[PDB]
């Protein structure tokens, strides 16, 4: 009788977005070191190495 209205809850959404930030920062910070994976060169006689 007194009115109406939409809304968005805060605590559920706040915990959820905390989960989102945790998930993104996890996936970005759970990759370890990177190595210089340059394709090296070898002769035409030693390519067992290659």
């Amino acid at each position: 009788e007194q009115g109406s209205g939409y809304a968005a809850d805060q605590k559920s959404t706040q915990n959820a977005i905390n989960g989102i930030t945790n998930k993104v920062n996890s996936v970005i910070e759970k990759m370890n070191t990177q190595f210089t994976a340059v394709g090296k060169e070898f002769n035409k006689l030693e390519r067992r190495m290659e």
């Binding site: 006689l45 030693e46 390519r47 067992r48």
Partner: protein, 50 residues
């Protein structure tokens, strides 16, 4: 490849003379201990690479 080794066959070992006349194929086969291989003794230079 039958009895001759790869060293034997590429050198035309006189025990797989019958192997001469096939020039197209799919995949080599090798008996694990080929005996009639390199008939004249020695040391194939860079055998594994070839």
């Amino acid at each position: 490849l039958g009895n001759c080794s790869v060293a034997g066959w590429i050198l035309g070992n006189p025990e797989c003379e019958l192997l001469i006349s096939k020039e197209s194929w799919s995949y080599i086969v090798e008996t694990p201990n080929p005996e009639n291989g390199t008939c004249y003794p020695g040391y194939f230079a860079d055998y594994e690479e070839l």
